[PDB]
Design a protein around this nucleic acid. Sequence first.
DNA 1: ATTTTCAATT
Length: 199
Amino acid sequence: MEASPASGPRHLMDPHIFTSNFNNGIGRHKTYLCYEVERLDNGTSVKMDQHRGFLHNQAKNLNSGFYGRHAQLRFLDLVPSLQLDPAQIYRVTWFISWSPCFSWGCAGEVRAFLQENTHVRLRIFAARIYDYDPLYKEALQMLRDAGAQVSIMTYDEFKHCWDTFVDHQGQPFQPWDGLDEHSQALSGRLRAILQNQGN
DNA sequence: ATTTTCAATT
Ligand SMILES: [Zn+2]
């Protein structure tokens, strides 16, 4: 297991794990949540020294054997840690490999946060939409009520994501021929869920 | 455009 270099900083993401996790292929994949924090200044976006970070659904705990719930809930507690103030506007984007998520408290608590902080802008990016049965359709509409901000990832974003999430020299990102077929479906799948809004 | 996928330990 070569894994990422020990002398290297944990801020860099391994290329195999990043590609394998973003590959969305059939086999074994660990759910990962990536988020970014930026400070807006009079309409001017400003980035801090380094607030990039991500969370995984895999943790350790043999003595308690207890596992954390949805990674989205854990990030919710990360909001108060930053101590965001209502006098300023901050842009927070959450990236999740899967979009579907059945739960009566996950989206419920997340929706309550948006209602409590209407000045906070939250963007949700769905790398792939296929994890829960069609029921997730109603769950998506519930979150869309307060999170009316849904966007799909594009191949161009993948190139930048690798450089931003991965910074290796001599190992360029090698895109797989699968975004074109899903890229068009992602737009069709996203509008399909919103099409129910006409009802 | 589609691909009948692992996640709590030893
Ligand atoms: Zn959830």
